[PDB]
C-alpha cells in the first residue's frame, strides 16, 4: 500500500 504523507516528519 502506497503512503502519501502530506506533512514533513515531526519528532515533537
Amino acid at each position: 500500500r502506497p503512503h502519501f504523507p502530506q506533512f514533513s516528519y515531526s519528532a515533537s
Epitope: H3, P5, F7, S8, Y9, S10, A11, S12
Partner: single-chain antibody, 227 residues
C-alpha cells in the same frame, strides 16, 4: 508550555501580529486556530519546521504565518469585526499526521470601531456521574488515510487537551476512560465512568486531502453536562 501573546483591541484595518512561544519551538511545526466567542474551533493555517506554509481557503489574504528562531507569528492582515476571537497556537504531534498534542491557552483579539462539514452530537448532552456517554462525529468527506482524526477536550480559559489521535490512539497521560472509534466518515468518542470534571466541550478534528479542500477541519463541539 506554548504561550500566545499580542492580543488587544484594534480598529478595523489595523494590522496585528500575535506570537507563539514555548518554554525549543524551532523544531516544532505550528498551526493557528481561532474561536469566536461562544463558537467552535476553526483552523487558520500551518507552518512547517522549516517554514513551509499551508492555509485554510477562507484565510487567504487575511492571515500571514511566519517564523524565525524562537517564535512563530500570525499577522492579521486587515482585521474586521469578523475576526474578534481567541487565537490559539498548537504543535503537531509525532509522525506525519495533522493533529495537535500541545496548545496554548489563547490570546484574545477584539476588533471594533470602538466545503467540509463535520457534524457532532448536538449540545448539550447530559451524563450522570458513573455513567457512560457516546459522542458522534460525522464528516462530509472522509478523513485522510481513513483514520487521521483526533479528539480534544476544552474547558473555559484552558488549553484544549488532546485525548485521542489516529481515531483510536490514547494520548500520553490521558485516562483510559476515553475511547475513540470509527473510520472514514463516521467516528465516536466514548467517556466511561463519567466524573464531574469531564464537563467540557469535546471537538473532533480531521486531517483531510489537501487537494480536496482544506488540510484540516473541526466539528462544531459537543458540550457534556454532568449530573
Amino acid at each position: 508550555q506554548l504561550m500566545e501573546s499580542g492580543g488587544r483591541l484594534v480598529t478595523p484595518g489595523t494590522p496585528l501580529t500575535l506570537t507563539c512561544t514555548a518554554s525549543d519551538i524551532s523544531t516544532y511545526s505550528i498551526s493557528w486556530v481561532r474561536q469566536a466567542p461562544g463558537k467552535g474551533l476553526e483552523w487558520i493555517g500551518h507552518i512547517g519546521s522549516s517554514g513551509t506554509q499551508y492555509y485554510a481557503s477562507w484565510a487567504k489574504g487575511r492571515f500571514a504565518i511566519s517564523r524565525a528562531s524562537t517564535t512563530v507569528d500570525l499577522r492579521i492582515t486587515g482585521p474586521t469585526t469578523e475576526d474578534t476571537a481567541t487565537y490559539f497556537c498548537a504543535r503537531r504531534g509525532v509522525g506525519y499526521n495533522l493533529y495537535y498534542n500541545m496548545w496554548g491557552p489563547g490570546t484574545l483579539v477584539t476588533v471594533s470601531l470602538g466545503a467540509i462539514d463535520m457534524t457532532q452530537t448536538p449540545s448539550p448532552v447530559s451524563a450522570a456521574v458513573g455513567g457512560t456517554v457516546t459522542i458522534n462525529c460525522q464528516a462530509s468527506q472522509s478523513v485522510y488515510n481513513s483514520k487521521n482524526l483526533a479528539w480534544y477536550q476544552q474547558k473555559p480559559g484552558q488549553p484544549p487537551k488532546l485525548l485521542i489521535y489516529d481515531s483510536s490512539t490514547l494520548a500520553s497521560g490521558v485516562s483510559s476512560r476515553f475511547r475513540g472509534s470509527g473510520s472514514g466518515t463516521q467516528f465516536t468518542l466514548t467517556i466511561s465512568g463519567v466524573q464531574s470534571d469531564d464537563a467540557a466541550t469535546y471537538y473532533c478534528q480531521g486531517e483531510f486531502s489537501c487537494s480536496s479542500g482544506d488540510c484540516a477541519g473541526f466539528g462544531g463541539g459537543t458540550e457534556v453536562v454532568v449530573e
